[PDB]
mmCIF file of all heavy atoms in Angstrom:
data_model
loop_
_atom_site.group_PDB
_atom_site.id
_atom_site.type_symbol
_atom_site.label_atom_id
_atom_site.label_comp_id
_atom_site.label_asym_id
_atom_site.label_seq_id
_atom_site.Cartn_x
_atom_site.Cartn_y
_atom_site.Cartn_z
ATOM 1 N N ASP A 110 2.647 -10.229 15.005
ATOM 2 C CA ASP A 110 3.178 -10.946 16.080
ATOM 3 C C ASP A 110 4.434 -11.636 15.586
ATOM 4 O O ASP A 110 4.596 -12.840 15.933
ATOM 5 C CB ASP A 110 2.145 -11.903 16.665
ATOM 6 C CG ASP A 110 1.071 -11.107 17.333
ATOM 7 O OD1 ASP A 110 1.175 -9.969 17.722
ATOM 8 O OD2 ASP A 110 -0.122 -11.627 17.418
ATOM 9 N N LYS A 111 5.198 -10.895 14.905
ATOM 10 C CA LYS A 111 6.486 -11.504 14.270
ATOM 11 C C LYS A 111 6.303 -12.502 13.223
ATOM 12 O O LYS A 111 7.310 -12.954 12.607
ATOM 13 C CB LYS A 111 7.331 -12.091 15.479
ATOM 14 C CG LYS A 111 7.737 -10.959 16.491
ATOM 15 C CD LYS A 111 8.558 -9.829 15.770
ATOM 16 C CE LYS A 111 9.058 -8.770 16.845
ATOM 17 N NZ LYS A 111 10.075 -9.189 17.716
ATOM 18 N N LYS A 112 5.153 -12.798 12.823
ATOM 19 C CA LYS A 112 4.876 -13.695 11.751
ATOM 20 C C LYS A 112 5.130 -13.093 10.462
ATOM 21 O O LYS A 112 4.533 -12.007 10.144
ATOM 22 C CB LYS A 112 3.420 -14.287 11.771
ATOM 23 C CG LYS A 112 2.987 -15.104 10.586
ATOM 24 C CD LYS A 112 1.529 -15.404 10.574
ATOM 25 C CE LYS A 112 1.151 -16.032 9.285
ATOM 26 N NZ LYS A 112 1.808 -17.372 8.995
ATOM 27 N N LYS A 113 5.940 -13.703 9.561
ATOM 28 C CA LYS A 113 6.159 -13.161 8.241
ATOM 29 C C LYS A 113 5.241 -13.908 7.120
ATOM 30 O O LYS A 113 5.198 -15.137 7.245
ATOM 31 C CB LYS A 113 7.612 -13.332 7.884
ATOM 32 C CG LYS A 113 8.627 -12.524 8.739
ATOM 33 C CD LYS A 113 10.111 -12.903 8.369
ATOM 34 C CE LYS A 113 11.038 -12.063 9.226
ATOM 35 N NZ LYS A 113 12.379 -12.538 9.037
ATOM 36 N N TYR A 114 4.536 -13.144 6.337
ATOM 37 C CA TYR A 114 3.833 -13.788 5.232
ATOM 38 C C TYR A 114 4.670 -13.892 4.050
ATOM 39 O O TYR A 114 5.753 -13.382 3.861
ATOM 40 C CB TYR A 114 2.602 -12.884 4.940
ATOM 41 C CG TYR A 114 1.494 -12.923 5.968
ATOM 42 C CD1 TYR A 114 1.531 -12.103 7.068
ATOM 43 C CD2 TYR A 114 0.470 -13.910 5.790
ATOM 44 C CE1 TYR A 114 0.490 -12.198 8.091
ATOM 45 C CE2 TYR A 114 -0.577 -13.991 6.825
ATOM 46 C CZ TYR A 114 -0.528 -13.035 7.963
ATOM 47 O OH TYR A 114 -1.550 -13.203 8.811
ATOM 48 N N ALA A 115 4.213 -14.719 3.063
ATOM 49 C CA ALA A 115 4.873 -14.961 1.841
ATOM 50 C C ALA A 115 5.081 -13.694 0.929
ATOM 51 O O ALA A 115 6.096 -13.670 0.175
ATOM 52 C CB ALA A 115 4.243 -16.041 1.013
ATOM 53 N N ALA A 116 4.276 -12.817 1.070
ATOM 54 C CA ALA A 116 4.351 -11.567 0.319
ATOM 55 C C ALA A 116 3.458 -10.518 0.808
ATOM 56 O O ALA A 116 2.637 -10.720 1.709
ATOM 57 C CB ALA A 116 4.014 -11.847 -1.166
ATOM 58 N N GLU A 117 3.587 -9.323 0.263
ATOM 59 C CA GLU A 117 2.710 -8.204 0.790
ATOM 60 C C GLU A 117 2.488 -7.324 -0.415
ATOM 61 O O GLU A 117 3.396 -6.849 -1.188
ATOM 62 C CB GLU A 117 3.329 -7.440 1.870
ATOM 63 C CG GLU A 117 2.429 -6.483 2.580
ATOM 64 C CD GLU A 117 3.172 -5.705 3.817
ATOM 65 O OE1 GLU A 117 3.927 -6.422 4.581
ATOM 66 O OE2 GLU A 117 2.929 -4.476 4.067
ATOM 67 N N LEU A 118 1.066 -6.961 -0.575
ATOM 68 C CA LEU A 118 0.703 -6.128 -1.644
ATOM 69 C C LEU A 118 0.396 -4.671 -1.032
ATOM 70 O O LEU A 118 0.000 -4.398 0.020
ATOM 71 C CB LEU A 118 -0.637 -6.557 -2.061
ATOM 72 C CG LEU A 118 -1.523 -5.737 -2.936
ATOM 73 C CD1 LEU A 118 -0.716 -5.259 -4.310
ATOM 74 C CD2 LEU A 118 -2.880 -6.380 -3.320
ATOM 75 N N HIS A 119 1.029 -3.797 -1.920
ATOM 76 C CA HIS A 119 0.986 -2.286 -1.474
ATOM 77 C C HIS A 119 0.238 -1.449 -2.591
ATOM 78 O O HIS A 119 0.805 -1.412 -3.627
ATOM 79 C CB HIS A 119 2.423 -1.707 -1.239
ATOM 80 C CG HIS A 119 2.970 -2.268 -0.011
ATOM 81 N ND1 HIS A 119 4.305 -2.162 0.311
ATOM 82 C CD2 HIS A 119 2.434 -2.859 1.108
ATOM 83 C CE1 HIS A 119 4.575 -2.670 1.459
ATOM 84 N NE2 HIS A 119 3.464 -3.100 2.042
ATOM 85 N N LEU A 120 -0.853 -0.916 -2.187
ATOM 86 C CA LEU A 120 -1.585 -0.022 -3.031
ATOM 87 C C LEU A 120 -1.320 1.266 -2.626
ATOM 88 O O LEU A 120 -1.708 1.752 -1.457
ATOM 89 C CB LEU A 120 -3.193 -0.413 -2.856
ATOM 90 C CG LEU A 120 -3.459 -1.754 -3.422
ATOM 91 C CD1 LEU A 120 -4.403 -2.587 -2.520
ATOM 92 C CD2 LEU A 120 -4.140 -1.648 -4.765
ATOM 93 N N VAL A 121 -0.643 2.007 -3.461
ATOM 94 C CA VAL A 121 -0.223 3.475 -3.014
ATOM 95 C C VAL A 121 -1.222 4.538 -3.513
ATOM 96 O O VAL A 121 -1.554 4.619 -4.590
ATOM 97 C CB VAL A 121 1.281 3.664 -3.691
ATOM 98 C CG1 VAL A 121 1.819 5.042 -3.175
ATOM 99 C CG2 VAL A 121 2.249 2.572 -3.258
ATOM 100 N N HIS A 122 -1.468 5.462 -2.519
ATOM 101 C CA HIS A 122 -2.385 6.610 -2.797
ATOM 102 C C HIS A 122 -1.840 7.749 -2.335
ATOM 103 O O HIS A 122 -1.265 7.926 -1.258
ATOM 104 C CB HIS A 122 -3.799 6.393 -2.155
ATOM 105 C CG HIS A 122 -4.386 4.980 -2.352
ATOM 106 N ND1 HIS A 122 -3.827 3.949 -1.723
ATOM 107 C CD2 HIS A 122 -5.440 4.525 -2.871
ATOM 108 C CE1 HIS A 122 -4.551 2.826 -1.928
ATOM 109 N NE2 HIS A 122 -5.582 3.097 -2.733
ATOM 110 N N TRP A 123 -2.205 8.986 -3.043
ATOM 111 C CA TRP A 123 -1.720 10.329 -2.599
ATOM 112 C C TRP A 123 -2.893 11.207 -2.288
ATOM 113 O O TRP A 123 -3.839 11.111 -2.904
ATOM 114 C CB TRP A 123 -0.739 10.977 -3.613
ATOM 115 C CG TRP A 123 -1.254 11.110 -4.900
ATOM 116 C CD1 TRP A 123 -1.306 10.052 -5.943
ATOM 117 C CD2 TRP A 123 -1.953 12.198 -5.588
ATOM 118 N NE1 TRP A 123 -1.872 10.574 -7.086
ATOM 119 C CE2 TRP A 123 -2.265 11.937 -6.862
ATOM 120 C CE3 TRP A 123 -2.116 13.474 -5.073
ATOM 121 C CZ2 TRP A 123 -2.859 12.824 -7.865
ATOM 122 C CZ3 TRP A 123 -2.842 14.309 -5.945
ATOM 123 C CH2 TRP A 123 -3.185 14.073 -7.358
ATOM 124 N N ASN A 124 -2.615 12.000 -1.199
ATOM 125 C CA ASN A 124 -3.602 13.001 -0.726
ATOM 126 C C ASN A 124 -3.962 13.987 -1.886
ATOM 127 O O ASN A 124 -2.999 14.879 -2.242
ATOM 128 C CB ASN A 124 -3.151 13.683 0.487
ATOM 129 C CG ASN A 124 -4.216 14.215 1.280
ATOM 130 O OD1 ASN A 124 -5.132 14.893 0.654
ATOM 131 N ND2 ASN A 124 -4.179 14.163 2.537
ATOM 132 N N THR A 125 -5.124 13.989 -2.356
ATOM 133 C CA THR A 125 -5.439 14.988 -3.440
ATOM 134 C C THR A 125 -5.438 16.484 -3.109
ATOM 135 O O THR A 125 -5.386 17.318 -3.980
ATOM 136 C CB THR A 125 -6.843 14.730 -3.940
ATOM 137 O OG1 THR A 125 -7.941 14.894 -2.965
ATOM 138 C CG2 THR A 125 -6.978 13.174 -4.509
ATOM 139 N N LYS A 126 -5.501 16.758 -1.757
ATOM 140 C CA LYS A 126 -5.394 18.200 -1.497
ATOM 141 C C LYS A 126 -3.999 18.807 -1.702
ATOM 142 O O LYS A 126 -3.759 20.005 -1.678
ATOM 143 C CB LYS A 126 -5.789 18.438 0.021
ATOM 144 C CG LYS A 126 -4.767 18.078 1.099
ATOM 145 C CD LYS A 126 -5.401 18.411 2.454
ATOM 146 C CE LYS A 126 -4.306 17.984 3.533
ATOM 147 N NZ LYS A 126 -4.826 18.595 4.807
ATOM 148 N N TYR A 127 -3.016 17.922 -2.108
ATOM 149 C CA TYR A 127 -1.636 18.410 -2.426
ATOM 150 C C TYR A 127 -1.347 18.536 -3.812
ATOM 151 O O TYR A 127 -0.243 18.818 -4.272
ATOM 152 C CB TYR A 127 -0.641 17.567 -1.675
ATOM 153 C CG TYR A 127 -0.777 17.686 -0.185
ATOM 154 C CD1 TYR A 127 -0.817 16.442 0.595
ATOM 155 C CD2 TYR A 127 -0.704 18.883 0.451
ATOM 156 C CE1 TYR A 127 -1.019 16.531 1.954
ATOM 157 C CE2 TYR A 127 -0.924 19.006 1.844
ATOM 158 C CZ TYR A 127 -1.014 17.888 2.626
ATOM 159 O OH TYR A 127 -1.285 17.853 3.946
ATOM 160 N N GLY A 128 -2.395 18.431 -4.598
ATOM 161 C CA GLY A 128 -2.298 18.529 -6.032
ATOM 162 C C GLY A 128 -1.598 17.359 -6.923
ATOM 163 O O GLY A 128 -2.154 17.002 -7.976
ATOM 164 N N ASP A 129 -0.537 17.050 -6.465
ATOM 165 C CA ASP A 129 0.275 15.972 -7.236
ATOM 166 C C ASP A 129 1.058 14.919 -6.312
ATOM 167 O O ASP A 129 1.191 15.269 -5.073
ATOM 168 C CB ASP A 129 1.057 16.510 -8.283
ATOM 169 C CG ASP A 129 2.377 17.151 -7.760
ATOM 170 O OD1 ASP A 129 3.243 16.471 -7.084
ATOM 171 O OD2 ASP A 129 2.609 18.393 -8.068
ATOM 172 N N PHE A 130 1.456 13.833 -6.795
ATOM 173 C CA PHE A 130 2.197 12.845 -6.118
ATOM 174 C C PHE A 130 3.514 13.512 -5.387
ATOM 175 O O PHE A 130 3.859 13.206 -4.334
ATOM 176 C CB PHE A 130 2.557 11.801 -7.126
ATOM 177 C CG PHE A 130 2.963 10.505 -6.637
ATOM 178 C CD1 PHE A 130 2.424 10.097 -5.268
ATOM 179 C CD2 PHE A 130 3.838 9.689 -7.211
ATOM 180 C CE1 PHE A 130 2.604 8.944 -4.722
ATOM 181 C CE2 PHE A 130 4.128 8.390 -6.640
ATOM 182 C CZ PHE A 130 3.426 8.024 -5.504
ATOM 183 N N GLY A 131 4.149 14.239 -6.317
ATOM 184 C CA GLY A 131 5.472 14.923 -5.884
ATOM 185 C C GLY A 131 5.248 15.787 -4.706
ATOM 186 O O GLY A 131 6.143 15.772 -3.775
ATOM 187 N N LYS A 132 4.309 16.688 -4.651
ATOM 188 C CA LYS A 132 3.985 17.599 -3.693
ATOM 189 C C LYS A 132 3.588 16.837 -2.312
ATOM 190 O O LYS A 132 3.944 17.110 -1.224
ATOM 191 C CB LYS A 132 2.892 18.618 -4.022
ATOM 192 C CG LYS A 132 2.621 19.706 -2.937
ATOM 193 C CD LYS A 132 3.766 20.474 -2.629
ATOM 194 C CE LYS A 132 4.141 21.362 -3.756
ATOM 195 N NZ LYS A 132 5.292 22.286 -3.591
ATOM 196 N N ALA A 133 2.901 15.789 -2.602
ATOM 197 C CA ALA A 133 2.321 14.958 -1.484
ATOM 198 C C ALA A 133 3.548 14.286 -0.698
ATOM 199 O O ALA A 133 3.414 14.274 0.594
ATOM 200 C CB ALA A 133 1.473 13.769 -2.155
ATOM 201 N N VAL A 134 4.400 13.957 -1.289
ATOM 202 C CA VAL A 134 5.720 13.340 -0.561
ATOM 203 C C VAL A 134 6.526 14.369 0.212
ATOM 204 O O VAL A 134 7.564 14.027 0.603
ATOM 205 C CB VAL A 134 6.584 12.331 -1.460
ATOM 206 C CG1 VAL A 134 5.796 11.173 -1.983
ATOM 207 C CG2 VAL A 134 6.991 13.224 -2.611
ATOM 208 N N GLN A 135 5.956 15.557 0.504
ATOM 209 C CA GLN A 135 6.695 16.507 1.070
ATOM 210 C C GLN A 135 5.749 16.869 2.322
ATOM 211 O O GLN A 135 6.021 17.814 2.972
ATOM 212 C CB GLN A 135 6.797 17.883 0.262
ATOM 213 C CG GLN A 135 7.701 17.689 -1.012
ATOM 214 C CD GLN A 135 7.902 18.884 -1.887
ATOM 215 O OE1 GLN A 135 7.745 20.042 -1.264
ATOM 216 N NE2 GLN A 135 8.210 18.630 -3.172
ATOM 217 N N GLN A 136 4.845 16.219 2.480
ATOM 218 C CA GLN A 136 3.736 16.289 3.562
ATOM 219 C C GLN A 136 3.744 15.112 4.530
ATOM 220 O O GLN A 136 3.985 14.034 4.102
ATOM 221 C CB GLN A 136 2.411 16.505 2.911
ATOM 222 C CG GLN A 136 2.454 17.385 1.684
ATOM 223 C CD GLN A 136 2.953 18.807 1.906
ATOM 224 O OE1 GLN A 136 2.661 19.389 2.981
ATOM 225 N NE2 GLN A 136 3.634 19.348 0.801
ATOM 226 N N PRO A 137 3.381 15.362 5.793
ATOM 227 C CA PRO A 137 3.281 14.278 6.810
ATOM 228 C C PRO A 137 2.173 13.373 6.513
ATOM 229 O O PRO A 137 2.202 12.173 6.966
ATOM 230 C CB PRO A 137 3.099 14.989 8.100
ATOM 231 C CG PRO A 137 3.755 16.401 7.832
ATOM 232 C CD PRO A 137 3.328 16.724 6.394
ATOM 233 N N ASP A 138 1.149 13.883 5.834
ATOM 234 C CA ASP A 138 -0.026 13.018 5.553
ATOM 235 C C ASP A 138 -0.266 13.064 3.984
ATOM 236 O O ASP A 138 -1.356 13.089 3.644
ATOM 237 C CB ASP A 138 -1.437 13.565 6.165
ATOM 238 C CG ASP A 138 -1.506 15.112 5.817
ATOM 239 O OD1 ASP A 138 -0.652 15.676 5.045
ATOM 240 O OD2 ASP A 138 -2.487 15.660 6.269
ATOM 241 N N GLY A 139 0.935 13.073 3.285
ATOM 242 C CA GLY A 139 0.813 13.026 1.864
ATOM 243 C C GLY A 139 0.353 11.718 1.212
ATOM 244 O O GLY A 139 -0.222 11.718 0.164
ATOM 245 N N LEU A 140 0.719 10.683 1.889
ATOM 246 C CA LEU A 140 0.472 9.427 1.245
ATOM 247 C C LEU A 140 -0.357 8.418 2.197
ATOM 248 O O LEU A 140 -0.383 8.546 3.403
ATOM 249 C CB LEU A 140 1.712 8.549 0.810
ATOM 250 C CG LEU A 140 2.616 9.259 -0.050
ATOM 251 C CD1 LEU A 140 3.877 8.445 -0.257
ATOM 252 C CD2 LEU A 140 1.919 9.699 -1.492
ATOM 253 N N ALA A 141 -0.995 7.425 1.591
ATOM 254 C CA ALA A 141 -1.849 6.441 2.283
ATOM 255 C C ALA A 141 -1.434 5.129 1.538
ATOM 256 O O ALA A 141 -1.772 5.105 0.300
ATOM 257 C CB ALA A 141 -3.285 6.690 2.294
ATOM 258 N N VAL A 142 -0.868 4.091 2.147
ATOM 259 C CA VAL A 142 -0.713 2.870 1.551
ATOM 260 C C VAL A 142 -1.527 1.760 2.267
ATOM 261 O O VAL A 142 -1.455 1.574 3.368
ATOM 262 C CB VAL A 142 0.673 2.382 1.636
ATOM 263 C CG1 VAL A 142 1.057 1.229 0.783
ATOM 264 C CG2 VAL A 142 1.643 3.535 0.934
ATOM 265 N N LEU A 143 -2.272 1.079 1.414
ATOM 266 C CA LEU A 143 -3.092 -0.039 1.761
ATOM 267 C C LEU A 143 -2.333 -1.284 1.704
ATOM 268 O O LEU A 143 -2.019 -1.681 0.514
ATOM 269 C CB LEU A 143 -4.351 -0.160 1.029
ATOM 270 C CG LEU A 143 -5.369 -1.185 1.278
ATOM 271 C CD1 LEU A 143 -5.781 -1.066 2.752
ATOM 272 C CD2 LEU A 143 -6.609 -1.254 0.320
ATOM 273 N N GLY A 144 -1.962 -1.935 2.784
ATOM 274 C CA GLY A 144 -1.203 -3.223 2.700
ATOM 275 C C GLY A 144 -2.055 -4.477 2.752
ATOM 276 O O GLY A 144 -2.920 -4.396 3.762
ATOM 277 N N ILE A 145 -1.739 -5.433 2.072
ATOM 278 C CA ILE A 145 -2.465 -6.726 2.018
ATOM 279 C C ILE A 145 -1.437 -7.811 2.114
ATOM 280 O O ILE A 145 -0.594 -8.020 1.168
ATOM 281 C CB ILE A 145 -3.425 -6.712 0.877
ATOM 282 C CG1 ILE A 145 -4.472 -5.675 0.983
ATOM 283 C CG2 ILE A 145 -4.101 -8.164 1.062
ATOM 284 C CD1 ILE A 145 -5.315 -5.595 -0.287
ATOM 285 N N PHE A 146 -1.576 -8.761 3.125
ATOM 286 C CA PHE A 146 -0.639 -9.879 3.164
ATOM 287 C C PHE A 146 -1.155 -10.958 2.174
ATOM 288 O O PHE A 146 -2.204 -11.104 1.905
ATOM 289 C CB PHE A 146 -0.654 -10.447 4.634
ATOM 290 C CG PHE A 146 -0.073 -9.647 5.716
ATOM 291 C CD1 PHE A 146 -0.943 -9.007 6.619
ATOM 292 C CD2 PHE A 146 1.203 -9.125 5.624
ATOM 293 C CE1 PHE A 146 -0.372 -8.231 7.601
ATOM 294 C CE2 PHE A 146 1.725 -8.256 6.521
ATOM 295 C CZ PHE A 146 0.987 -7.732 7.534
ATOM 296 N N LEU A 147 -0.080 -11.786 1.741
ATOM 297 C CA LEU A 147 -0.425 -12.832 0.862
ATOM 298 C C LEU A 147 0.234 -14.043 1.536
ATOM 299 O O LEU A 147 1.224 -14.218 1.911
ATOM 300 C CB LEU A 147 0.335 -12.655 -0.455
ATOM 301 C CG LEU A 147 -0.298 -11.825 -1.581
ATOM 302 C CD1 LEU A 147 -0.453 -10.356 -1.056
ATOM 303 C CD2 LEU A 147 0.575 -11.802 -2.728
ATOM 304 N N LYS A 148 -0.590 -15.218 1.486
ATOM 305 C CA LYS A 148 -0.139 -16.418 1.987
ATOM 306 C C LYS A 148 -0.265 -17.449 0.868
ATOM 307 O O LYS A 148 -1.085 -17.191 -0.108
ATOM 308 C CB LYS A 148 -1.020 -16.884 3.231
ATOM 309 C CG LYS A 148 -2.487 -17.153 2.911
ATOM 310 C CD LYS A 148 -3.198 -17.560 4.169
ATOM 311 C CE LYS A 148 -4.638 -17.909 3.854
ATOM 312 N NZ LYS A 148 -5.327 -18.486 5.064
ATOM 313 N N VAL A 149 0.411 -18.541 0.932
ATOM 314 C CA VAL A 149 0.333 -19.595 -0.088
ATOM 315 C C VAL A 149 -0.712 -20.563 0.149
ATOM 316 O O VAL A 149 -0.767 -21.131 1.271
ATOM 317 C CB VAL A 149 1.658 -20.268 -0.317
ATOM 318 C CG1 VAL A 149 1.623 -21.268 -1.400
ATOM 319 C CG2 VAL A 149 2.656 -19.202 -0.701
ATOM 320 N N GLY A 150 -1.539 -20.691 -0.723
ATOM 321 C CA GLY A 150 -2.658 -21.673 -0.682
ATOM 322 C C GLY A 150 -3.410 -21.768 -2.008
ATOM 323 O O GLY A 150 -2.883 -22.083 -2.964
ATOM 324 N N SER A 151 -4.695 -21.487 -2.060
ATOM 325 C CA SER A 151 -5.578 -21.434 -3.130
ATOM 326 C C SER A 151 -5.060 -20.243 -4.025
ATOM 327 O O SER A 151 -4.555 -19.238 -3.457
ATOM 328 C CB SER A 151 -6.988 -21.415 -2.862
ATOM 329 O OG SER A 151 -7.509 -22.426 -2.074
ATOM 330 N N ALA A 152 -5.271 -20.329 -5.375
ATOM 331 C CA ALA A 152 -4.873 -19.340 -6.253
ATOM 332 C C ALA A 152 -5.742 -18.186 -6.097
ATOM 333 O O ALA A 152 -6.995 -18.241 -5.656
ATOM 334 C CB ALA A 152 -4.822 -19.773 -7.675
ATOM 335 N N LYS A 153 -5.336 -16.831 -6.433
ATOM 336 C CA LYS A 153 -6.091 -15.692 -6.348
ATOM 337 C C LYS A 153 -6.467 -15.384 -7.838
ATOM 338 O O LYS A 153 -5.504 -14.936 -8.589
ATOM 339 C CB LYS A 153 -5.366 -14.539 -5.740
ATOM 340 C CG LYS A 153 -6.198 -13.339 -5.532
ATOM 341 C CD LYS A 153 -7.320 -13.615 -4.449
ATOM 342 C CE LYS A 153 -8.146 -12.432 -4.122
ATOM 343 N NZ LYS A 153 -9.199 -12.787 -3.211
ATOM 344 N N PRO A 154 -7.642 -15.832 -8.346
ATOM 345 C CA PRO A 154 -8.087 -15.437 -9.879
ATOM 346 C C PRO A 154 -7.705 -14.092 -10.339
ATOM 347 O O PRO A 154 -7.131 -14.068 -11.446
ATOM 348 C CB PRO A 154 -9.529 -15.751 -9.691
ATOM 349 C CG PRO A 154 -9.694 -16.819 -8.686
ATOM 350 C CD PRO A 154 -8.782 -16.281 -7.567
ATOM 351 N N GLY A 155 -7.971 -13.160 -9.403
ATOM 352 C CA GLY A 155 -7.688 -11.717 -9.858
ATOM 353 C C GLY A 155 -6.355 -11.344 -10.060
ATOM 354 O O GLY A 155 -6.053 -10.262 -10.642
ATOM 355 N N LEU A 156 -5.436 -12.257 -9.555
ATOM 356 C CA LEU A 156 -3.941 -11.864 -9.674
ATOM 357 C C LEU A 156 -3.296 -12.456 -10.904
ATOM 358 O O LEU A 156 -2.301 -12.158 -11.377
ATOM 359 C CB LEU A 156 -3.249 -12.369 -8.500
ATOM 360 C CG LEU A 156 -1.708 -12.458 -8.554
ATOM 361 C CD1 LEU A 156 -1.333 -10.838 -8.508
ATOM 362 C CD2 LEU A 156 -1.128 -12.965 -7.257
ATOM 363 N N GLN A 157 -4.061 -13.485 -11.517
ATOM 364 C CA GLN A 157 -3.374 -14.180 -12.723
ATOM 365 C C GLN A 157 -3.046 -13.357 -13.808
ATOM 366 O O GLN A 157 -2.011 -13.542 -14.551
ATOM 367 C CB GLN A 157 -4.365 -15.337 -13.159
ATOM 368 C CG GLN A 157 -3.531 -16.380 -13.978
ATOM 369 C CD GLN A 157 -2.354 -16.934 -13.430
ATOM 370 O OE1 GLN A 157 -2.421 -17.303 -12.286
ATOM 371 N NE2 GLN A 157 -1.381 -17.035 -14.220
#
C-alpha cells in the first residue's frame, strides 16, 4: 500500500526440474524468490 520498509530479504531458489541455476533462468518458472520485509525495532538474533 505504498509503504516502504527499512529493508527486504530475498531467499533465491531455482526450479530443480531444469537441472541448474543457469538453465532455470531461461524458463518462465525457473525461479522462486521468498521475500521478507525488515522493519527497525527489536534485534533479530538469527541475523547477528
Side-chain angles (χ1 to χ4, degrees):
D110 288 339
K111 296 303 176 76
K112 171 191 171 62
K113 295 175 182 174
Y114 284 86
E117 192 173 322
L118 164 61
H119 288 164
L120 293 135
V121 185
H122 314 70
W123 54 276
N124 198 321
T125 63
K126 74 175 181 176
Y127 296 126
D129 72 60
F130 200 31
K132 179 65 63 177
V134 293
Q135 293 179 28
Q136 323 297 326
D138 58 354
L140 306 179
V142 182
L143 179 61
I145 301 170
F146 294 116
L147 277 63
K148 64 176 181 178
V149 179
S151 297
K153 190 62 176 177
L156 176 64
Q157 201 52 46

